[PDB]
Curated annotation (Swiss-Prot):
Required for translation of most natural mRNAs except for leaderless mRNA. Binds mRNA upstream of the Shine-Dalgarno (SD) sequence and helps it bind to the 30S ribosomal subunit; acts as an RNA chaperone to unfold structured mRNA on the ribosome but is not essential for mRNAs with strong SDs and little 5'-UTR structure, thus it may help fine-tune which mRNAs that are translated. Unwinds dsRNA by binding to transiently formed ssRNA regions; binds about 10 nucleotides. Has a preference for polypyrimidine tracts. Negatively autoregulates its own translation. It is not clear if it plays a role in trans-translation (a process which rescues stalled ribosomes). Evidence for its role; binds to tmRNA with very high affinity, is required for binding of tmRNA to 30S subunit. Thought to play a role only in translation of the tmRNA in vitro. Evidence against its role; overexpression of whole protein or various S1 fragments inhibits translation, they have no effect on trans-translation, and an in vitro system with S1-less ribosomes performs trans-translation. Belongs to the bacterial ribosomal protein bS1 family. Induction: Represses its own translation via the N-terminus (at protein level). Disulfide bonds: none annotated. Phosphorylated; probably on a serine. Residues 12-81 form the S1 motif domain. It comes from Escherichia coli (strain K12). Signal peptide: none annotated. The 6 S1 motif domains are not equivalent; the first 2 no longer bind rRNA but instead are involved in protein-ribosome and protein-protein interactions. Binds to the 30S ribosomal subunit via its N-terminal fragment (190 residues, the first 2 S1 motifs) and allows translation by S1-free ribosomes. The same fragment represses its own translation. The first 3 S1 motifs do however bind to mRNA pseudoknots in the 5'-UTR of at least 1 mRNA (rpsO); deletion of S1 motifs 1-3 but not motifs 4-6 is not viable, although a deletion of motifs 4-6 grows slowly and is cold-sensitive. Part of the 30S ribosomal subunit; the largest protein subunit, it is loosely associated and not always found in ribosomal crystal structures. Does not bind rRNA. Probably requires ribosomal protein uS2 to associate with the 30S subunit. Binds in the junction of the head, platform and main body of the 30S subunit; the N-terminus penetrates the 30S subunit while the C-terminus faces ribosomal protein uS2. Nascent polypeptide chains cross-link this protein in situ. Can be cross-linked to mRNA in the ribosome. It is found in: Cytoplasm. The chain holds residues 441 to 528 of 557 of the full protein. It comes from the Bacteria. Disruption phenotype: Essential, it cannot be deleted. Upon depletion cell growth and total protein synthesis become linear. This is Small ribosomal subunit protein bS1.
Length: 89
C-alpha cells in the first residue's frame, strides 16, 4: 500500500479499505500489497446508528481519511470518515 507510496503520495487524503480482521477495539482494514490501515467500531453508515452498516460486510470497502503513519511499523492509520478534522476545528 502506503509503504512504497510515502515517496509519491501524502497524508490528509482519502483511501478505500476493505474489512477483514479484528483488534480488541478495532478492525484492521485491508489496504493492499499485504498491509492494513485502521477501521473504527462504527463501520461506516453516513450519519449515526445504522446507515450503510447493514450493507457493508467483511471483505467490502469504505473510504477513510489518511491520518498518519507509525515509523516503527511502517504503515498507515486510517480514521473511517473522509474529512475527520472538519467539524468546527
Amino acid at each position: 500500500m502506503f509503504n512504497n507510496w510515502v515517496a509519491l503520495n501524502k497524508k490528509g487524503a482519502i483511501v478505500t479499505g476493505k474489512v477483514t480482521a479484528v483488534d480488541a477495539k478495532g478492525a484492521t482494514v485491508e489496504l493492499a500489497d499485504g498491509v492494513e490501515g485502521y477501521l473504527r467500531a462504527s463501520e461506516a453508515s453516513r450519519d449515526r446508528v445504522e446507515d450503510a452498516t447493514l450493507v457493508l460486510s467483511v471483505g467490502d470497502e469504505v473510504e477513510a481519511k489518511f491520518t498518519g503513519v507509525d515509523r516503527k511499523n511502517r504503515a498507515i492509520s486510517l480514521s473511517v470518515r473522509a474529512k475527520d478534522e472538519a467539524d468546527e476545528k
